[PDB]
């Protein structure tokens, strides 16, 4: 009724602050770090992926107020392609940064061999291409099938017609939420268990406070990943399993679920690029 007209405001303020923060992070990366070391490459990767995914967010809002897709066939394939591209790019950038930190801590002698800024650039191009390898089937299946009266934007399946789309949501769930959580909780927990045996951060309580700061930052980033991308992947399986009746309070809370889905894309460079020491220089 009248709550949807402000649901668009609560849906788009996340896109506004996300694109604003991503523009700030990519600008300070391109103007004050000059991508010399390897870590700024991954930071700029995550900033670009979250910027493109956050600019994707005002596209879906017209499917909640206007009900149609008043952009047409000429943008539906493109928007869904870059959405499912930037999503897996943000996920795999977090996974690759986690693997980079685990190599840099737990295997230091091998970390002198691997994580040079040349190899960081080529593994960044590698996971961009690996994100494209699952984004392009979503581009090749994103048609436009009209409703009662509207212009729509959705995804169809190939042959077999009904069952093929059921593979896609389970694949995105097990390959975009189960595997990244399962890699970055172990890939950071073994880093924490290694740093608890480091004499540089063990005693002399100010240094123990610095070790506490590292553990707080790691627990906060894993917890904000889980808290952001749990319900958008839980409800997308609950909708597929059981048929929910449409309730007049339901869809505004589910678009809020989409909002805290993209709130990871908002607050991820806010959590990284501000809570470091490279912001001071």
């Amino acid at each position: 009724m009248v709550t949807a007209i402000t649901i668009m405001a609560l849906y788009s303020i996340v896109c506004v602050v996300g694109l604003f923060g991503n523009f700030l992070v990519m600008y300070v990366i391109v103007r004050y770090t000059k991508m010399k070391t390897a870590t700024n490459i991954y930071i700029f990767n995550l900033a670009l992926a979250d910027a493109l995914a956050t600019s994707t967010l005002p596209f879906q809002s017209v499917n909640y107020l206007m009900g149609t897709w008043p952009f047409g066939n000429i943008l539906c394939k493109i928007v869904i392609s870059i959405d499912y591209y930037n999503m897996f790019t943000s996920i795999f950038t977090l996974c690759t940064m986690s693997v980079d930190r685990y190599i840099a801590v737990c295997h230091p002698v091998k970390a002198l061999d691997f994580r040079t800024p040349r190899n960081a650039k080529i593994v960044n191009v590698c996971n961009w291409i690996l994100s494209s390898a699952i984004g392009l089937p979503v581009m090749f299946m994103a048609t436009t099938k009209y409703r009662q009266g509207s212009i729509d934007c959705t995804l169809t399946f190939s042959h077999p017609t009904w069952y093929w789309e059921n593979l896609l949501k389970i694949c995105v769930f097990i390959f975009a939420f189960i595997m990244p959580v399962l890699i970055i909780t172990v890939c950071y927990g073994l880093m924490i268990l290694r740093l608890k045996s480091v004499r540089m951060l063990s005693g002399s309580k100010e240094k123990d406070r610095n070790l506490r700061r590292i553990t707080r930052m790691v627990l906060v980033v894993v917890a904000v990943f889980i808290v952001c991308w749990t319900p958008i992947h839980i409800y997308v399986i609950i909708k597929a399993l059981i048929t929910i009746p449409e309730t007049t309070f339901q869809t505004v809370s589910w678009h809020f679920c989409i909002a805290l889905g993209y709130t990871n894309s908002c607050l991820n460079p806010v959590l990284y690029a501000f809570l470091d020491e490279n912001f001071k220089r």
């Binding site: 539906c76 997308v236 678009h255």
Partner: peptide
Amino acid sequence: YXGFX
């Protein structure tokens, strides 16, 4: 994600 369907 969660949009379009």
